[PDB]
Design a protein around this motif. Structure first.
Motif, PDB file in Angstrom:
ATOM      1  N   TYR A 130       0.855  -1.186   0.000  1.00 45.61           N
ATOM      2  CA  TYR A 130       0.000   0.000   0.000  1.00 45.61           C
ATOM      3  C   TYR A 130       0.880   1.222   0.000  1.00 45.61           C
ATOM      4  O   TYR A 130       0.574   2.182  -0.692  1.00 45.61           O
ATOM      5  CB  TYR A 130      -0.855   0.016   1.265  1.00 45.61           C
ATOM      6  CG  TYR A 130      -1.787   1.216   1.480  1.00 45.61           C
ATOM      7  CD1 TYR A 130      -3.066   1.244   0.927  1.00 45.61           C
ATOM      8  CD2 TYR A 130      -1.422   2.274   2.325  1.00 45.61           C
ATOM      9  CE1 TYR A 130      -3.931   2.316   1.163  1.00 45.61           C
ATOM     10  CE2 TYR A 130      -2.281   3.333   2.567  1.00 45.61           C
ATOM     11  CZ  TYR A 130      -3.535   3.364   1.981  1.00 45.61           C
ATOM     12  OH  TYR A 130      -4.411   4.434   2.238  1.00 45.61           O
ATOM     13  N   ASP A 131       1.977   1.183   0.768  1.00 43.34           N
ATOM     14  CA  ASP A 131       2.873   2.337   0.855  1.00 43.34           C
ATOM     15  C   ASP A 131       3.543   2.503  -0.482  1.00 43.34           C
ATOM     16  O   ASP A 131       3.738   3.612  -0.978  1.00 43.34           O
ATOM     17  CB  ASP A 131       3.945   2.157   1.936  1.00 43.34           C
ATOM     18  CG  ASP A 131       3.365   1.935   3.309  1.00 43.34           C
ATOM     19  OD1 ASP A 131       2.768   2.880   3.850  1.00 43.34           O
ATOM     20  OD2 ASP A 131       3.462   0.854   3.934  1.00 43.34           O
ATOM     21  N   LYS A 132       3.910   1.377  -1.057  1.00 44.07           N
ATOM     22  CA  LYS A 132       4.524   1.364  -2.357  1.00 44.07           C
ATOM     23  C   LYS A 132       3.584   2.074  -3.296  1.00 44.07           C
ATOM     24  O   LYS A 132       3.973   3.037  -3.950  1.00 44.07           O
ATOM     25  CB  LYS A 132       4.771  -0.081  -2.798  1.00 44.07           C
ATOM     26  CG  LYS A 132       5.584  -0.217  -4.067  1.00 44.07           C
ATOM     27  CD  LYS A 132       5.976  -1.687  -4.330  1.00 44.07           C
ATOM     28  CE  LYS A 132       6.882  -2.265  -3.213  1.00 44.07           C
ATOM     29  NZ  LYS A 132       6.133  -2.986  -2.122  1.00 44.07           N
ATOM     30  N   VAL A 133       2.334   1.629  -3.338  1.00 38.29           N
ATOM     31  CA  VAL A 133       1.339   2.256  -4.197  1.00 38.29           C
ATOM     32  C   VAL A 133       1.356   3.788  -4.085  1.00 38.29           C
ATOM     33  O   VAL A 133       1.352   4.509  -5.079  1.00 38.29           O
ATOM     34  CB  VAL A 133      -0.084   1.751  -3.848  1.00 38.29           C
ATOM     35  CG1 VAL A 133      -1.144   2.695  -4.393  1.00 38.29           C
ATOM     36  CG2 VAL A 133      -0.292   0.320  -4.376  1.00 38.29           C
ATOM     37  N   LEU A 134       1.395   4.274  -2.853  1.00 40.57           N
ATOM     38  CA  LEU A 134       1.343   5.697  -2.600  1.00 40.57           C
ATOM     39  C   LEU A 134       2.551   6.433  -3.106  1.00 40.57           C
ATOM     40  O   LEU A 134       2.513   7.644  -3.271  1.00 40.57           O
ATOM     41  CB  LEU A 134       1.120   5.972  -1.122  1.00 40.57           C
ATOM     42  CG  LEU A 134      -0.310   5.671  -0.680  1.00 40.57           C
ATOM     43  CD1 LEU A 134      -0.509   6.084   0.770  1.00 40.57           C
ATOM     44  CD2 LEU A 134      -1.313   6.402  -1.595  1.00 40.57           C
ATOM     45  N   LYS A 135       3.627   5.714  -3.366  1.00 40.63           N
ATOM     46  CA  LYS A 135       4.791   6.369  -3.911  1.00 40.63           C
ATOM     47  C   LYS A 135       4.463   6.941  -5.295  1.00 40.63           C
ATOM     48  O   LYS A 135       4.971   7.989  -5.657  1.00 40.63           O
ATOM     49  CB  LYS A 135       6.000   5.415  -3.981  1.00 40.63           C
ATOM     50  CG  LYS A 135       6.703   5.172  -2.639  1.00 40.63           C
ATOM     51  CD  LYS A 135       7.895   4.204  -2.780  1.00 40.63           C
ATOM     52  CE  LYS A 135       8.557   3.880  -1.417  1.00 40.63           C
ATOM     53  NZ  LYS A 135       9.641   2.807  -1.474  1.00 40.63           N
ATOM     54  N   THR A 136       3.591   6.267  -6.046  1.00 35.72           N
ATOM     55  CA  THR A 136       3.275   6.656  -7.427  1.00 35.72           C
ATOM     56  C   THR A 136       1.905   7.301  -7.611  1.00 35.72           C
ATOM     57  O   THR A 136       1.709   8.132  -8.495  1.00 35.72           O
ATOM     58  CB  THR A 136       3.366   5.425  -8.348  1.00 35.72           C
ATOM     59  OG1 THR A 136       4.652   4.812  -8.209  1.00 35.72           O
ATOM     60  CG2 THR A 136       3.328   5.839  -9.810  1.00 35.72           C
ATOM     61  N   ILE A 137       0.943   6.893  -6.800  1.00 30.47           N
ATOM     62  CA  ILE A 137      -0.384   7.460  -6.896  1.00 30.47           C
ATOM     63  C   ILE A 137      -0.562   8.380  -5.715  1.00 30.47           C
ATOM     64  O   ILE A 137      -0.089   8.092  -4.621  1.00 30.47           O
ATOM     65  CB  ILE A 137      -1.479   6.376  -6.885  1.00 30.47           C
ATOM     66  CG1 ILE A 137      -1.309   5.403  -8.050  1.00 30.47           C
ATOM     67  CG2 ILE A 137      -2.845   7.027  -7.019  1.00 30.47           C
ATOM     68  CD1 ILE A 137      -0.206   4.403  -7.874  1.00 30.47           C
ATOM     69  N   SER A 138      -1.216   9.510  -5.953  1.00 28.68           N
ATOM     70  CA  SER A 138      -1.519  10.460  -4.902  1.00 28.68           C
ATOM     71  C   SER A 138      -2.650   9.878  -4.073  1.00 28.68           C
ATOM     72  O   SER A 138      -3.403   9.033  -4.551  1.00 28.68           O
ATOM     73  CB  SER A 138      -1.939  11.799  -5.516  1.00 28.68           C
ATOM     74  OG  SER A 138      -2.935  11.622  -6.515  1.00 28.68           O
ATOM     75  N   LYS A 139      -2.766  10.299  -2.823  1.00 31.71           N
ATOM     76  CA  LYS A 139      -3.831   9.775  -1.989  1.00 31.71           C
ATOM     77  C   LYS A 139      -5.147  10.115  -2.666  1.00 31.71           C
ATOM     78  O   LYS A 139      -6.048   9.280  -2.795  1.00 31.71           O
ATOM     79  CB  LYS A 139      -3.791  10.402  -0.593  1.00 31.71           C
ATOM     80  CG  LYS A 139      -2.625   9.928   0.265  1.00 31.71           C
ATOM     81  CD  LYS A 139      -2.690  10.518   1.673  1.00 31.71           C
ATOM     82  CE  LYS A 139      -1.573   9.963   2.559  1.00 31.71           C
ATOM     83  NZ  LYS A 139      -1.683  10.450   3.963  1.00 31.71           N
ATOM     84  N   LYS A 140      -5.225  11.352  -3.128  1.00 31.87           N
ATOM     85  CA  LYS A 140      -6.421  11.859  -3.755  1.00 31.87           C
ATOM     86  C   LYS A 140      -6.947  10.914  -4.826  1.00 31.87           C
ATOM     87  O   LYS A 140      -7.969  10.260  -4.641  1.00 31.87           O
ATOM     88  CB  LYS A 140      -6.147  13.257  -4.320  1.00 31.87           C
ATOM     89  CG  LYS A 140      -7.363  13.997  -4.837  1.00 31.87           C
ATOM     90  CD  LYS A 140      -7.028  15.467  -5.021  1.00 31.87           C
ATOM     91  CE  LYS A 140      -8.123  16.218  -5.764  1.00 31.87           C
ATOM     92  NZ  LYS A 140      -8.025  16.036  -7.242  1.00 31.87           N
ATOM     93  N   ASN A 141      -6.246  10.827  -5.942  1.00 34.99           N
ATOM     94  CA  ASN A 141      -6.716   9.980  -7.036  1.00 34.99           C
ATOM     95  C   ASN A 141      -6.846   8.480  -6.678  1.00 34.99           C
ATOM     96  O   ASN A 141      -7.662   7.768  -7.256  1.00 34.99           O
ATOM     97  CB  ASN A 141      -5.896  10.229  -8.318  1.00 34.99           C
ATOM     98  CG  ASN A 141      -6.184  11.626  -8.956  1.00 34.99           C
ATOM     99  OD1 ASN A 141      -5.288  12.239  -9.551  1.00 34.99           O
ATOM    100  ND2 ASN A 141      -7.428  12.116  -8.829  1.00 34.99           N
ATOM    101  N   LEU A 142      -6.083   8.002  -5.708  1.00 36.58           N
ATOM    102  CA  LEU A 142      -6.252   6.613  -5.313  1.00 36.58           C
ATOM    103  C   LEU A 142      -7.619   6.449  -4.668  1.00 36.58           C
ATOM    104  O   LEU A 142      -8.293   5.450  -4.869  1.00 36.58           O
ATOM    105  CB  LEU A 142      -5.152   6.150  -4.359  1.00 36.58           C
ATOM    106  CG  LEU A 142      -5.375   4.764  -3.739  1.00 36.58           C
ATOM    107  CD1 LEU A 142      -4.971   3.650  -4.682  1.00 36.58           C
ATOM    108  CD2 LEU A 142      -4.622   4.625  -2.447  1.00 36.58           C
ATOM    109  N   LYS A 143      -8.036   7.440  -3.895  1.00 37.35           N
ATOM    110  CA  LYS A 143      -9.333   7.359  -3.234  1.00 37.35           C
ATOM    111  C   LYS A 143     -10.458   7.423  -4.245  1.00 37.35           C
ATOM    112  O   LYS A 143     -11.443   6.682  -4.158  1.00 37.35           O
ATOM    113  CB  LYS A 143      -9.504   8.489  -2.225  1.00 37.35           C
ATOM    114  CG  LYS A 143     -10.927   8.634  -1.714  1.00 37.35           C
ATOM    115  CD  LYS A 143     -11.021   9.689  -0.624  1.00 37.35           C
ATOM    116  CE  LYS A 143     -12.434   9.769  -0.027  1.00 37.35           C
ATOM    117  NZ  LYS A 143     -13.417  10.411  -0.950  1.00 37.35           N
ATOM    118  N   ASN A 144     -10.307   8.321  -5.205  1.00 39.92           N
ATOM    119  CA  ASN A 144     -11.337   8.503  -6.202  1.00 39.92           C
ATOM    120  C   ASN A 144     -11.363   7.338  -7.168  1.00 39.92           C
ATOM    121  O   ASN A 144     -12.426   6.883  -7.581  1.00 39.92           O
ATOM    122  CB  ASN A 144     -11.142   9.822  -6.937  1.00 39.92           C
ATOM    123  CG  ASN A 144     -11.332  11.022  -6.031  1.00 39.92           C
ATOM    124  OD1 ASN A 144     -11.941  10.911  -4.961  1.00 39.92           O
ATOM    125  ND2 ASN A 144     -10.801  12.168  -6.446  1.00 39.92           N
TER     126      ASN A 144
END
Length: 373
Positions: free
Chosen positions: A12-26
């Motif tokens: 999940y942390d890895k994911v956040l390295k590339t995707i912003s929290k914002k767009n990941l939520k949306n």
């Protein structure tokens, strides 16, 4: 009793390295919305072109204060509960990944004792080769001569090696992968009376997903409440035990359950879990190693893991997390399908956030207790 604080990094942390929290939520939100209307004959749980990979199942546990040699050479290590070995990249290593690592140089340590035995060892992410050497390994206030592997070839460990900031691996398991006569450092520490008991424990603070504490040698009362119940290993070489698994109405008797803080979720055989998911109206987020549904999903049961004498439960709140928004609308379910065989589950990080655990080599068992916070 020595307690090593370690940092944890998740997929999940890895994911956040590339995707912003914002767009990941949306992306997730807009995806679920699509599922509640879109693909009728849907209830997507993945495909041959959208699978959960083992790298999506592993947490990495970083401990960066261990040392090798009498001159304080520092290394970033990661813990592996599946193996007995310690290894550090050697000064003699010419691989590409080795150019960015802390390299061990035996010529600078007067406790170094040459051995030279060639070996290879395989992890799920690949193989490394080197040779045996023996030198002082220091972990906190503990220090002792210990036989480890000096790695000289890491090519087969790419692309992981150059992508993850670690130098070597310290085994918390039983199995010597070089099939040499190597004991886990914890057992050796006991063998040399550096510690009281050949055991170690894991305390994973419920409030800090990025943190964990490994205690070596003894049990700290401050980590747990109530009593510790023990379960006999059903295997000579792995922290594995027999439990009847209950996921709501879903049941598997006498399953093999591995206990591993190194695993990011609870894992289950894919049929058993896909089924589980198909009733709860859980969906897989396409292209991401996540499974989501409403945080207040009425049907989410309390998982039960039973032995002859004991019962362990995992209430919904321990395996469900708001996608990032501490505000619970959609939640990921901390469970991932992993096929090791027809019978095998892993109790990973989430189970260990609730249960403090003891790994006792002498008793050949895993101990369980309600973790104090």
């Amino acid at each position: 009793h020595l307690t090593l604080a370690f940092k944890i990094e998740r997929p999940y942390d890895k994911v956040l390295k590339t995707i912003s929290k914002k767009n990941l939520k949306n992306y997730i939100k807009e995806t679920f919305n699509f599922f509640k209307s879109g693909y009728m004959k849907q209830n997507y749980l993945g495909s041959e072109n959208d699978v959960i990979e083992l790298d999506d199942v592993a947490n990495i546990m970083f401990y960066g204060e261990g040392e090798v040699g009498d001159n304080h050479q520092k290394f970033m290590l990661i813990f592996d509960t599946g193996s007995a070995n310690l290894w550090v990249p050697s000064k003699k290593c010419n691989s590409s990944g080795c150019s960015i690592k802390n390299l061990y140089d035996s010529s600078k340590s007067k406790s170094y004792e040459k051995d030279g035995t060639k070996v290879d060892i395989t992890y799920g992410s690949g193989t490394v080769k080197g040779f045996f050497s023996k030198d002082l390994v220091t972990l906190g206030h503990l220090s002792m001569p210990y036989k480890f592997i000096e790695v000289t070839d890491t090519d087969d460990l790419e692309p992981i090696y150059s992508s993850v900031e670690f130098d070597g691996i310290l085994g918390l398991g039983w199995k010597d992968l070089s099939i040499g006569s190597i004991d886990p450092i914890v057992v050796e520490l006991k063998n040399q009376n550096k510690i009281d008991n050949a055991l170690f424990t894991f305390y994973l603070p419920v409030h800090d997903v990025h943190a964990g504490y490994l205690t070596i040698g003894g049990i700290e009362e401050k980590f747990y409440e109530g009593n510790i119940t023990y379960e006999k290993l059903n295997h000579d070489l792995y922290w594995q035990i027999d439990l009847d698994v209950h996921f709501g109405k879903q049941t598997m008797e006498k399953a093999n359950v591995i206990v591993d803080s190194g695993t990011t979720t609870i894992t289950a055989p894919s049929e058993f879990l896909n089924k589980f998911f198909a009733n709860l109206n859980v969906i897989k987020v396409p292209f991401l190693p996540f499974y989501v549904t409403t945080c207040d999903n009425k049907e989410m049961p309390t998982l039960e893991f039973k032995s002859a004498n004991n019962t362990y439960t995992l209430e919904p709140e321990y395996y469900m997390n708001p996608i990032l928004e501490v505000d619970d609308t959609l939640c990921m379910i901390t469970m991932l399908p992993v096929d090791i065989d027809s019978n095998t589950f892993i109790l990973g990080d989430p189970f260990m956030r609730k249960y403090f655990t003891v790994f006792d080599y002498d008793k050949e068992s895993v101990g369980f207790a309600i973790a104090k916070n």
